[PDB]
Amino acid sequence: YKLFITEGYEVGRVNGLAVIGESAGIVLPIIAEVTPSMEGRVIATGRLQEIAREAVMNVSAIIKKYTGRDISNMDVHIQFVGTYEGVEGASASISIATAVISAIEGIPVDQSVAMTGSLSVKGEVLPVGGVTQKIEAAIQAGLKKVIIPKDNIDDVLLDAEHEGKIEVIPVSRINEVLEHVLEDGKKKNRLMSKFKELEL
Amino acid sequence: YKLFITEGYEVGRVNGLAVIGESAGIVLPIIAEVTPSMEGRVIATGRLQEIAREAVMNVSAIIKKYTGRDISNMDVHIQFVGTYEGVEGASASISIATAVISAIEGIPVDQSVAMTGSLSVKGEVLPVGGVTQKIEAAIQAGLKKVIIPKDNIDDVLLDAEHEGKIEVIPVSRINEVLEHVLEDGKKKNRLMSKFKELEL
Amino acid sequence: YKLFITEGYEVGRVNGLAVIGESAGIVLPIIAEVTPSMEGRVIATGRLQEIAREAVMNVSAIIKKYTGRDISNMDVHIQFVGTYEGVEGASASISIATAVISAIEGIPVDQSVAMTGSLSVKGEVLPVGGVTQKIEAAIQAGLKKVIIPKDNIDDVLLDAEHEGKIEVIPVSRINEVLEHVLEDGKKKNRLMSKFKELEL
Amino acid sequence: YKLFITEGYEVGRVNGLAVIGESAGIVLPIIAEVTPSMEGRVIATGRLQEIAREAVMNVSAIIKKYTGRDISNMDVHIQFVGTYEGVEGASASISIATAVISAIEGIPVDQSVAMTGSLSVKGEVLPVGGVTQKIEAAIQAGLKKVIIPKDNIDDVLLDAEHEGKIEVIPVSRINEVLEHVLEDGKKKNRLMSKFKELEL
Amino acid sequence: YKLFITEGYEVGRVNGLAVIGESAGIVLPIIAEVTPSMEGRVIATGRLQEIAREAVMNVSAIIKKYTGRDISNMDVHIQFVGTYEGVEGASASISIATAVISAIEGIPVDQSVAMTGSLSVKGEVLPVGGVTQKIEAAIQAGLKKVIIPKDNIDDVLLDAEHEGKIEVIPVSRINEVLEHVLEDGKKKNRLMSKFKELEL
Amino acid sequence: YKLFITEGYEVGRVNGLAVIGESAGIVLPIIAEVTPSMEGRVIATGRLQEIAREAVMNVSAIIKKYTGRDISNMDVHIQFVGTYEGVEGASASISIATAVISAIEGIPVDQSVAMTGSLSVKGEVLPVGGVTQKIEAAIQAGLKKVIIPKDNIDDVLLDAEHEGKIEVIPVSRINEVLEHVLEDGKKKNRLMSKFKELEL
């Protein structure tokens, strides 16, 4: 069995990438759900819960500023699939942020893409460590694409036999991640129109 | 004596399956109780407490989204019957989730069924390890049925003399687990009507 | 001297039974005290502290559900009298649970009774090991009665000269334990009226 | 030199009695200090640290119940004077409990008294072993009085030439120990008034 | 070479005295360092590590009570210079305590002084064994002064040719040790003002 | 073959010097590795493991105080190359400390240097025994430089034909050792800037 899905589209689920130990990359699937708060809470358990809370608060800024969704009045649940000891996740991970936006908007995410990067409260995608290791993991998982921060493109020390078993997609801003992973359709179009101010 | 019940119906109690060491499967009975919080707490003690907290938070998402029960304002108590060293439980175990739903709704669970699987916050049943070992344990316990994730059906390496001393029931979503284990009646019917949106 | 009391009534004190090694039964007196929390804590030290924490959390469910006492806002102190190496106690021991209920309610417990059994969060008394050894210990201690789980009645391999130097009282639920050990009076009557829903 | 003081009054210091080997009694002076926690801690090091932690938790119940002092928000330091191999101390020792009450209340303790006994969380003084050996040690140390549990009075196998080189004071409850060892004055009177409910 | 410094001032370093075998005194230099804990730890290795842990916990009581320093949130490192087999150190050694206070406060210690004594959690200096042997060692090391507990002044069996090749300074309390060894200045004055309550 | 490298630069590896028997000096190469702790451990095996544990704890103080690295959350592995009977190593050896700093910082060490000395928790280099024997060993190994404690410069009883087949470098503090052995570059410069407070 596998803990990640590698093809097709799913709401609320993203293949993130992480590091275990110093340099063993792993695929870290995230699943998010949002519910009415019945003062909403971020609900996460386990080792990576702080990384989850930070990612949800940062994406909440962007969700409030650009889409006007009332995320402070929602409960946001973050699940990491597969509980590994000594995982390090990217702070304010873009995979968690993307999972949340997908779950709130009801727009499926491409499972054939993996991604790593740190989300700023302004919507930027900030550079992270271990990009080569994480790419290799995505290659081993048989993913088709990997999103990485622009500032980490120099940081890909592939191989000669690995370039390219995967498409690398550099990004500087969250709207770019969403263009690359959200299923095409009317809902995606409406959403992207709301981020035009972030582009500007 | 036995620590599990193997026939008839009980509110709040589910026969889960776990692994001890690498491959010794065991029946892991779960009992749940929910009380008013008099900001509710998840109360669990011992080695498997994190597995319990994760399962209750994930099922809480589904309970809030689909049934509208105010679980954040309830104390949820999770008990594992029999304290074994070096048990590994399925993350976000479906047995804990089912025990909680049974306890909140007051609908008894079939004790002749055992189950293993990981619950997603979206209501999916995700694949887990050690499925053959866990099935064997249920066979040894003289259970009649075992629920496993769909994605683990290939993972059943039974025997030739063991197929079939037990009915195997593959599942992809939590509402399926509930159809298979909750006592039939008006309360079960009302509950299942609330999950039709999960089916959809 | 003796570490246990064998006749008369005492608030907060119960003669539990345990096993040391494999089959040496011992009387394990428990004393409990509850104080305002001045977020309450369970306070226990030593080898059996986990058994104590589990028993107090399970009985807390029943105390909240049926009597409405705010036990989350109390400190609960559990003392085991006599510190023996390699004691094994019944998980979620009914003696600890009974000591707590006695201490909160201020209703003395019969010291001439010993008991063993595991408390479920639902209020059931679950079967335990070493029942013959534990009964013998109570006989040697000169106790008059012993409470055991119903499911362990077949498990009493007495002797021919030991049946009966003690009254054996089988139980299935916590309210039965309380009927058999709490001092008769108005406080006991009020309490038992609150458990009628557990009977039902 | 001597490790114990044998006359006059000192805050926070008590001459306890212990056994080394099987029957060599020794005077075991305890010194306690309490500080604001700046979630308080019990701080003890060495072989007898568990005995110390147990005694402080048990006396904390009584301190919270009867005097209302916030001991969970204090650091409690327990020192044993003289580090002897293979000392056995009375579980939940009344000497440690008395040292703590003296230190919190600022009321000096009579150094001419030694004591042994086990404190229950309810405030009782429970019987202990080796009472003759411990009394002899106090006699050899030239102490004037020794407090022992009531239930151990039969257990004093003195001599004919030793009865009485020391005053024996039997006790059943902690308030009695405090009446016998705390320096007389207004602070002692206030404190004892708070224990009247323990007498009752 | 020598393992101890015998003149001038150094932060964090104290010449303690110990016994090897039964009566061979030695100078036992201690060096301490305190760091932020980045729940602080006492870090000590080797044979005397328990003596070190005890001394640091006892001086921590005094540091918290009188100076208000948050020592529970500091890592305290204790080093013994020269690793000798079968050293016995004074329990809760005043040299370790002084090294810690010097290191936290940044106030140098006189290397021309050696000291021995046991620190109580109340700030007293308690008597210790082998005082003559330890004094002789300080004499052989060419130290100028030696601090000993008051109660050990009778215990100095010098010689006729050794009285006095060294100044003996008797002490009853820790503030006296600090008056005698800390470098004079504004920092020492501030510190000593905080101990006036210990004098009282 | 040789167990030590005598020219060029290597991360994590240092040529220390030790004594076998009374006066046979040997080159004692140390290799260190640091890993995330996945509460870190010092991992060392064999005869010199205590010397290794002491050196790592002392250098940890300096690493925490001056560079802010979280070494308590790292596993530190210390290997001694060549297992000789009856080696004596310098307590808190500066070679082990240097190997650790090199491994954490990723800055190679000059293999043409050997060193001996004891590290204080304050960062001083303390004198050690057998300096002549150790220097001779480095000469025989064909090393180019040897670092020794300042206080041992009088202790070099070379020869007339041995002065100088090697450069002797006296040191008083750890930052001096690092200036002399770490490969020049930006990483070394950054590190040395953090020790300026140790110089001061």
UniProtKB/Swiss-Prot annotation, chains A, B, C, D, E, F:
Location(s) in or outside the cell: Cell membrane
Parent-protein residues present: 416 to 618 of 621
UniProt signal peptide: none
Superkingdom assignment: Archaea
Active-site residues annotated for this sequence: S91, K134
Function text: ATP-dependent serine protease that mediates the selective degradation of mutant and abnormal proteins as well as certain short-lived regulatory proteins. Degrades polypeptides processively.
Residue ranges of domain Lon proteolytic in the record: 8-184
Name this protein carries in UniProt: Archaeal Lon protease
Family per record: Belongs to the peptidase S16 family. Archaeal LonB subfamily.
Quaternary assembly: Homohexamer. Organized in a ring with a central cavity.
